[PDB]
Amino acid sequence: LPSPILNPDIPYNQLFINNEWQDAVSKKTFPTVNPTTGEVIGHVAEGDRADVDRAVKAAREAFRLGSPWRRMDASERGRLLNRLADLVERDRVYLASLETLDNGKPFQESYALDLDEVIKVYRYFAGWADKWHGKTIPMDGQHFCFTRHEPVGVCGQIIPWNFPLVMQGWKLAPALATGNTVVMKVAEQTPLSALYLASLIKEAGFPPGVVNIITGYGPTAGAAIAQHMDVDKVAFTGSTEVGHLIQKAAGDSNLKRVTLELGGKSPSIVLADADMEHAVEQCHEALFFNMGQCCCAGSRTFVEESIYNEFLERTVEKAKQRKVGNPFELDTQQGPQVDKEQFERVLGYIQLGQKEGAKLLCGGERFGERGFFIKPTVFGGVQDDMRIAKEEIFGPVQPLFKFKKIEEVVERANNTRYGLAAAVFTRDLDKAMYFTQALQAGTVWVNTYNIVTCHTPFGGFKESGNGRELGEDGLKAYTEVKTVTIKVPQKNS
Amino acid sequence: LPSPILNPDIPYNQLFINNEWQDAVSKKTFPTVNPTTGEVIGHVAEGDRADVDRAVKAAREAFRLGSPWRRMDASERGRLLNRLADLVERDRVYLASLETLDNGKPFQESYALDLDEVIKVYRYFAGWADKWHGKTIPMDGQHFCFTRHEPVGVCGQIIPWNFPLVMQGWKLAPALATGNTVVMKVAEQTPLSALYLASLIKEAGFPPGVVNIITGYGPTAGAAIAQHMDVDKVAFTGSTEVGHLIQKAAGDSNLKRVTLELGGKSPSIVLADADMEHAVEQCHEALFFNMGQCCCAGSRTFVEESIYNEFLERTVEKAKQRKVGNPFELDTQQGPQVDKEQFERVLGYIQLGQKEGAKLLCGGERFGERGFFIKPTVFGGVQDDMRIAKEEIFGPVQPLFKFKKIEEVVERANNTRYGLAAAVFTRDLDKAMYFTQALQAGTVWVNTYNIVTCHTPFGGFKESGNGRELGEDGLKAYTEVKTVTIKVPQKNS
Amino acid sequence: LPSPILNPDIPYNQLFINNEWQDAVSKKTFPTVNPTTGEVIGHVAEGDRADVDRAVKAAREAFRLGSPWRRMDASERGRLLNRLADLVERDRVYLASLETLDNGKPFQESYALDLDEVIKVYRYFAGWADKWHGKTIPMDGQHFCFTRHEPVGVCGQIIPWNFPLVMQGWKLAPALATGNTVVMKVAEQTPLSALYLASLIKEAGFPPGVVNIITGYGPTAGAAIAQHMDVDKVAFTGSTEVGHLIQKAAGDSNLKRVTLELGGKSPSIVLADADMEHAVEQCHEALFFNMGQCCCAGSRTFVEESIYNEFLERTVEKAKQRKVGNPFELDTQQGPQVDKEQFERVLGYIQLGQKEGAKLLCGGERFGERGFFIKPTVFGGVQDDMRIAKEEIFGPVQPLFKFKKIEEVVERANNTRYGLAAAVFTRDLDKAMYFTQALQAGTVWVNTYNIVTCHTPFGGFKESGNGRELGEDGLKAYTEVKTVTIKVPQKNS
Amino acid sequence: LPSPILNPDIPYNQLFINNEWQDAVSKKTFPTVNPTTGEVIGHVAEGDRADVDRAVKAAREAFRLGSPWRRMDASERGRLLNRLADLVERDRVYLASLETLDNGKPFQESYALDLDEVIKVYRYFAGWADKWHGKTIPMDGQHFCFTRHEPVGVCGQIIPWNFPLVMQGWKLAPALATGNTVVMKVAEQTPLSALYLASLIKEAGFPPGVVNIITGYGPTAGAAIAQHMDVDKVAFTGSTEVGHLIQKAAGDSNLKRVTLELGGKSPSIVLADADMEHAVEQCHEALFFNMGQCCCAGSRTFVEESIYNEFLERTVEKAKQRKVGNPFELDTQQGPQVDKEQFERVLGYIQLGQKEGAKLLCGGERFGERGFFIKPTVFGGVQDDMRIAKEEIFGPVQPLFKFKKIEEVVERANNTRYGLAAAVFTRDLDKAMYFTQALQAGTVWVNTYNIVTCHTPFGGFKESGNGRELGEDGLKAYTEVKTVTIKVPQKNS
Ligand SMILES: NC(=O)c1ccc[n+]([C@@H]2O[C@H](COP(=O)([O-])OP(=O)(O)OC[C@H]3O[C@@H](n4cnc5c(N)ncnc54)[C@H](O)[C@@H]3O)[C@@H](O)[C@H]2O)c1
Ligand SMILES: COc1ccccc1-c1c[n+](-c2ccc(-c3ccccc3)cc2)c2n1CCCCN2
Ligand code: NA
Ligand code: NA
Helix axes B429-438, A429-438, angle to 10 degrees: 90
Strand order in the sheet with D181-185: D20-22, D15-17, D211-214, D181-185, D154-158, D233-237, D257-261, D465-466
Which of C69, C146, C428 minimises the CB distance to D136? C146
- Which bin fits B357, alpha (ψ -120 to 50), beta or left (φ > 0)? left
DSSP characters over C383-428: -TTSHHHHS---SSEEEEEEE--HHHHHHHHH-SS--SEEEEE-SB
B27: buried, middle or exposed (CB in 10 Å: 19+, 13-18, 0-12)?
exposed
Q: What is the resolution of this structure in A?
A: 2.3
Distance of CA A274 to the CA centre of its chain: 29
Q: What is the rounded CA–CA span in Å between residue A102 and residue A34?
A: 5
Q: Do C492 and D70 touch (CB under 8 A)?
A: yes
The answer to whether the annotation marks B39 as part of a ligand binding site is no
Euclidean distance between the first and the last CA atom of chain D, given in angstroms as a whole number: 61
The answer to whether the annotation marks A239 as part of a ligand binding site is yes
D433 touches chain A (CB under 8 A): no
Euclidean distance between the first and the last CA atom of chain C, given in angstroms as a whole number: 60
Per DSSP, helices labelled H in A72-227 are 74-90, 92-103, 107-109, 115-128, 164-177, 192-204, 223-227
Give strand pairing partners of B136.
A134, B146
Helix axes C164-177, C115-128, angle to 10 degrees: 10
Q: Strands A443-446 and B181-185, how do they pair?
A: unpaired
Which of A135, A428, A491 minimises the CB distance to B136? A135
Query: Following CA atoms C117, C118, C121, C126 in sequence, which dihedral angle do they give, to the nearest 10 degrees?
Result: -140
Q: What is the rounded CA–CA span in Å between residue C281 and residue A221?
A: 56
Q: Strands B154-158 and D29-33, how do they pair?
A: unpaired
Q: What is the rounded CA–CA span in Å between residue A127 and residue A74?
A: 10
Of B60, B78, B253, the C-alpha closest to B155 is: B60
Which of C251, C447, C486 minimises the CB distance to B486? C447
Please report which helix (H) or strand (E) contains residue A303, including its range: strand A298-304
Does the Cβ of C193 fall within 6 Å of ligand 1?
no
A473 touches chain D (CB under 8 A): yes
C475, C233 contact by CB (below 8 A): no
Give strand pairing partners of B286.
none
D440 three-state secondary structure: coil
Q: Strands C479-487 and D181-185, how do they pair?
A: unpaired
Instruction: Enter the DSSP assignment of A278.
Output: H
D385, D412 contact by CB (below 8 A): no
The whole-angstrom distance between C440's CA and the closest CA on chain A is 12
Q: Give residue numbers after which chain A breaks (C–N above 2.5 Å).
A: none
**How far, in Å, is the centroid of ligand 4 from the Cα of C34?**
5
Strand runs labelled E in C26-177: 29-34, 39-45, 134-137, 143-151, 154-158
Q: Which of C261, C304, C463, C469 is catalytic?
A: C261
D27: buried, middle or exposed (CB in 10 Å: 19+, 13-18, 0-12)?
exposed
Please report which helix (H) or strand (E) contains residue B250, including its range: helix B240-252
C476 three-state secondary structure: helix
The answer to whether the annotation marks D25 as part of a ligand binding site is no
The whole-angstrom distance between D471's CA and the closest CA on chain B is 8
For Cα atoms B54, B58, B64, give the angle at the middle one, nearest 5 degrees. 140
Give the 3-state secondary structure percentages of chain B, helix then strand then coil, rounded to 5.
40, 20, 35
Of C290, C291, C311, the C-alpha closest to C301 is: C311
A213, A198 contact by CB (below 8 A): yes
Catalytic site includes residue D294: no
Helix axes D115-128, B115-128, angle to 10 degrees: 120
D269, D409 contact by CB (below 8 A): yes
- Most B CBs within 10 A among C227, C252, C255, C478, hence the mutation to make, goes to C255
The answer to whether the annotation marks A315 as part of a ligand binding site is no
Q: What is the rounded CA–CA span in Å between residue A419 and residue D255?
A: 12
The answer to whether the annotation marks D243 as part of a ligand binding site is yes
Give strand pairing partners of C17.
C20
Q: Name every residue whose Cβ is closer than 8 Å to that of residue A30 and which is 6 or more positions away in sequence.
A: A43, A44, A46, A188, A215, A216, A217
Which ligand neighbours the alpha carbon of C458 most closely? 1
Chain C residue closest to A79 (CA)?
A: C123
Atom 39 (ligand 1): residue with closest C-alpha? Answer: C187
C9 touches chain D (CB under 8 A): no
Q: Which of residues 98-127 of C touch B (CB under 8 A)?
A: 120
C163, C171 contact by CB (below 8 A): no
The whole-angstrom distance between B173's CA and the closest CA on chain A is 16
**How far, in Å, is the centroid of ligand 2 from the Cα of C390?**
24
DSSP characters over D117-166: HHHHHHHHHHHHTTT--EEEE--SSSEEEEEEEEE--EEEEE--SSSHHH
Q: What is the rounded CA–CA span in Å between residue D66 and residue D48?
A: 30
- Which bin fits C405, alpha (ψ -120 to 50), beta or left (φ > 0)? beta
- Most B CBs within 10 A among D73, D77, D80, D82, hence the mutation to make, goes to D82
Q: What is the rounded CA–CA span in Å between residue B115 and residue D399?
A: 60
What single-letter amino acid sits at D378? V
Please report which helix (H) or strand (E) contains residue C451, including its range: none
Chain B residue closest to D74 (CA)?
A: B455
DSSP characters over B176-200: HHTT-EEEEE--SS--HHHHHHHHH
D92: buried, middle or exposed (CB in 10 Å: 19+, 13-18, 0-12)?
middle
Which ligand neighbours the alpha carbon of A342 most closely? 3
Q: What is the rounded CA–CA span in Å between residue A236 and residue D81?
A: 37
B145 touches chain C (CB under 8 A): yes
For Cα atoms A381, A386, A389, give the angle at the middle one, nearest 5 degrees. 75
Q: What is the rounded CA–CA span in Å between residue B57 and residue B48?
A: 15
Q: Do C244 and B257 touch (CB under 8 A)?
A: no
**Cα-atom radius of gyration of chain A, to the nearest Å?**
23
Q: What is the rounded CA–CA span in Å between residue A6 and residue A26?
A: 32
Q: What is the rounded CA–CA span in Å between residue B363 and residue D242?
A: 77
Q: Which of residues 236-255 of B touch C (CB under 8 A)?
A: 240, 243-252, 254-255
Q: Name every residue whose Cβ is closer than 8 Å to that of residue C353 and which is 6 or more positions away in sequence.
A: C360, C379, C382, C386, C388, C397, C399
Instruction: Enter the DSSP assignment of A206.
Output: P
Distance of CA C473 to the CA centre of its chain: 16
How far CA D362 is from CA of D323, D356, D368, in Å, comes to: 14, 17, 15
Helix axes D192-204, D74-90, angle to 10 degrees: 130
D419 three-state secondary structure: coil
Q: What is the rounded CA–CA span in Å between residue C295 and residue C290?
A: 10
Q: Name every residue whose Cβ is closer than 8 Å to that of residue D355 and which is 6 or more positions away in sequence.
A: none
DSSP characters over C2-32: PPP-SS------SEEETTEEE--TT--EEEE
Q: What is the rounded CA–CA span in Å between residue C295 and residue B421?
A: 40
Which of C131, C486, C488 minimises the CB distance to A128? C131
Of B165, B105, B111, the C-alpha closest to B336 is: B105
Distance of CA C290 to the CA centre of its chain: 12
What C348-354 contacts at long range (C-beta under 8 Å, 24+ apart), as own/partner pairs, is C349/C387, C349/C388, C349/C391, C349/C393, C349/C395, C349/C397, C350/C374, C350/C377, C350/C397, C352/C387, C352/C388, C353/C379, C353/C382, C353/C386, C353/C388, C353/C397, C353/C399
Experimental approach: X-ray
Q: Do B448 and C476 touch (CB under 8 A)?
A: no
Q: Strands B465-466 and B257-261, how do they pair?
A: antiparallel
B426, B275 contact by CB (below 8 A): no
Which of B120, B255, B417 minimises the CB distance to C260? B255
Chain B residue closest to D129 (CA)?
A: B127
D224, D49 contact by CB (below 8 A): yes
- Which bin fits B211, alpha (ψ -120 to 50), beta or left (φ > 0)? beta
CA neighbours within 13 Å on the CB side: how many for D8?
Answer: 19
Q: Strands D377-380 and D266-270, how do they pair?
A: unpaired
Which residues of chain D are within 8 Å of residue A244 when distances are taken between CB atoms? 251-252, 255
Instruction: Work out whether the CA dihedral D435, D440, D442, D443 comes out positive or negative.
Output: negative
D364, D414 contact by CB (below 8 A): no
Please report which helix (H) or strand (E) contains residue A409, including its range: helix A406-414
A391: buried, middle or exposed (CB in 10 Å: 19+, 13-18, 0-12)?
middle
How far CA A426 is from CA of A87, A404, A430, A443, D120, in Å, comes to: 42, 15, 10, 17, 47
Instruction: Work out whether the CA dihedral D66, D67, D73, D78 comes out positive or negative.
Output: negative
For Cα atoms C171, C172, C174, give the angle at the middle one, nearest 5 degrees. 80
Does the Cβ of C16 fall within 6 Å of ligand 2?
no
Q: Name every residue whose Cβ is closer than 8 Å to that of residue C312 and which is 6 or more positions away in sequence.
A: C303, C361, C378, C380, C400
Other CB atoms closer than 10 Å to residue C394's CB: what's the count? 24
B412 touches chain C (CB under 8 A): no
Q: Which of residues 440-459 of B touch D (CB under 8 A)?
A: 454-455
A453, B453 contact by CB (below 8 A): no
- Which bin fits A67, alpha (ψ -120 to 50), beta or left (φ > 0)? beta
Helix axes A276-288, A308-321, angle to 10 degrees: 50
Instruction: Work out whether the CA dihedral D102, D103, D104, D110 comes out positive or negative.
Output: negative
Instruction: Work out whether the CA dihedral A304, A310, A316, A319 comes out positive or negative.
Output: negative
Of C294, C371, C387, C363, the C-alpha closest to C327 is: C371
Helix axes A192-204, A164-177, angle to 10 degrees: 30
Give strand pairing partners of D485.
A445, D145
Distance of CA C433 to the CA centre of its chain: 28
Q: Do B448 and C260 touch (CB under 8 A)?
A: no
- Most C CBs within 10 A among D69, D144, D493, hence the mutation to make, goes to D493
Does the Cβ of C463 fall within 6 Å of ligand 1?
no
For Cα atoms C229, C231, C237, give the angle at the middle one, nearest 5 degrees. 120
C357 touches chain D (CB under 8 A): no
Q: Strands A143-151 and A134-137, how do they pair?
A: antiparallel
DSSP characters over D173-227: HHHHHTT-EEEEE--SS--HHHHHHHHHHHHHTPPTTSEEEE-B-IIIIIHHHHT
Q: Which of residues 25-84 of B touch D (CB under 8 A)?
A: 75, 78-79, 82
Q: Do C486 and B247 touch (CB under 8 A)?
A: no
**Cα-atom radius of gyration of chain B, to the nearest Å?**
23
Chain C residue closest to B478 (CA)?
A: C467
Q: What is the rounded CA–CA span in Å between residue B5 and residue D60?
A: 47
Maximum separation of any 2 CA atoms in chain C, in Å = 81
Give strand pairing partners of C260.
C236, C466
Other CB atoms closer than 10 Å to residue B43's CB: what's the count? 13
Which ligand neighbours the alpha carbon of C36 most closely? 4
Q: What is the rounded CA–CA span in Å between residue D443 and residue A25?
A: 41
CA neighbours within 13 Å on the CB side: how many for C234?
Answer: 32
Of C299, C291, C296, the C-alpha closest to C395 is: C291
Domains of chain D: 15-263+461-482 (3.40.605.10), 266-446 (3.40.309.10)
Give strand pairing partners of B334.
B324
D30: buried, middle or exposed (CB in 10 Å: 19+, 13-18, 0-12)?
middle
Q: Do B462 and C232 touch (CB under 8 A)?
A: yes
A480, A150 contact by CB (below 8 A): yes
CA neighbours within 13 Å on the CB side: how many for A349?
Answer: 25
A378 three-state secondary structure: strand
D421, D442 contact by CB (below 8 A): yes
Which ligand neighbours the alpha carbon of C32 most closely? 4
B380 three-state secondary structure: strand
Residue C145 main-chain phi, psi, to 5 deg? -125, 130
